[PDB]
Amino acid sequence: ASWFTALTQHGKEGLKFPRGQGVPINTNSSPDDQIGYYRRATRRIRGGDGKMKDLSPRWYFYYLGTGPEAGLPYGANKDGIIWVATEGALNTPKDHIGTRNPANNAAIVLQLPQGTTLPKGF
């Protein structure tokens, strides 16, 4: 499980951030730790007609070296994965932060610093 709540893509543009932006605020992490990826999670449902459809994609953040793409190095090219890093982060895996157990931690509400650029529809 991600440490954070998702970003929902209500529009047609997939997620991306300008370099330096996009890492969720987490006061239980340090400057070196501010680096990772969002991963798209799509869900299907039965619509009100007889028919399966996609819900709006969700994008969940994971620290570098953790989560479903724990094996990927920063910048690796993969569909549904985008990368973010705050100025000064170390490009090292964040096993010390890891992923969340919902049994014993709520998700942290995803917040970005004042004035982050967001694609249309986030």
Author numbering: 50 to 171
Question: Could you pull the original sentences from the published paper?
Answer:
One central protein involved in the formation of regulatory ribonucleoprotein complexes (RNP) is the coronaviral structural protein nucleocapsid (N). N plays a major role in RNA genome replication, translation, and packaging and has further been found to interfere with host-integrated stress responses and stress granule formation. The N-NTD possesses a peculiar, hand-like three-dimensional fold, with a β-sheet palm and several flexible loops, arranged as fingers around the central β-sheet. The latter, together with the extraordinarily long basic β-hairpin finger, constitutes the positively charged primary RNA-binding surface.
Compared to the WT, the nat_mutants D63G and P80R appeared to form more distinct complex bands with SL4ext in the EMSAs. Interestingly, in contrast to the other nat_mutants, NMR-derived CSD plots for both mutants revealed more significant changes in comparison to the WT, suggesting a more far-reaching modulation of their fold or plasticity toward complex formation with RNA. We further investigated the RNA-binding of D63G and P80R, located in the N-loop and counter finger, respectively, by NMR spectroscopy. We were able to solve the 1.7 Å and 1.9 Å crystal structures for D63G and P80R, respectively. Surprisingly, both mutant structures superimposed with WT similarly well as the other nat_mutants, with RMSD values of 0.668 Å (D63G) and 0.898 Å (P80R), respectively. Although the overall differences between the mutant and WT structures were insignificant, a closer look at the site of mutation at position 63 revealed the loss of salt-bridge/H-bond interactions between residues G63 and R89 in our D63G structure. These subtle changes in intramolecular interactions possibly alter the flexibility of R89 sidechain and may lead to modulated RNA-binding properties of D63G. In line with the retained backbone at this position in the crystal structures, {1H}15N heteronuclear steady-state NOE (hetNOE) values of backbone amides in the D63G mutant do not differ significantly from WT around the site of mutation. From those, only P80R and D63G exhibit slightly increased affinity for RNA, which likely correlates with an increased positive surface charge that possibly supports RNA engagement. On the protein level, mutations D63G and P80R also impact the gene product of the overlapping shifted open reading frame ORF9b47,48, where they result in T60A and Q77E, respectively.
